[PDB]
Amino acid sequence: SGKLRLYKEKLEGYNRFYSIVKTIKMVTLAKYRAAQGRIRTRDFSLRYTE
Amino acid sequence: SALTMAEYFRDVEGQDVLLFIDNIFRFTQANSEVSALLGRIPAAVGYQPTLAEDLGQLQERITSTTKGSITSVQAVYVPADDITDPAPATTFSHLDATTVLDRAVAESGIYPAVNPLECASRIMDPDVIS
């Protein structure tokens, strides 16, 4: 039936919206951990700038 | 009636004939309308229980034999764009080449609105074609 498959198609799109977003979460959890080096090396350049 | 005329041209005249049918679904629809009054319990969706057998007898007559050849082109109506419906589905196994049209394709300005991902052909083999 089309009505039942309308929901199935709708859920089919939702099920992959998640995968693409999940891959984006992985993409943005690499760059967060790559830029975490600043956490260590900050808070000392701007001393006389204060 | 028309199929009988084509059969005569195929057998007696031994000619290669074309047979266009539009629409073959109405043959199923008409039998469903009378099925209720013949004392037959409706099947799923609401078609007659003899949907598969009645269509099969007609379709098998539409074939090319050793005497002649019939090239048949039949138009099938998919009610409410639901290709899971018993009538469209029952007709898929009685064909050598299926052309599935999609409304979404047409709405985008593409004509003919063919969905190549759903079509199929029996002669799509290297042995037959180049």
From TrEMBL, chain A:
Domain of life assignment: Eukaryota
Protein's cellular compartments: Membrane
Protein family per UniProt: Belongs to the ATPase gamma chain family.
Protein name: ATP synthase gamma subunit
Organism the protein comes from: Trypanosoma brucei brucei
Lineage, uppermost ranks: Eukaryota, Discoba, Euglenozoa, Kinetoplastea, Metakinetoplastina
Covered range of the whole protein: 2 to 51 of 305
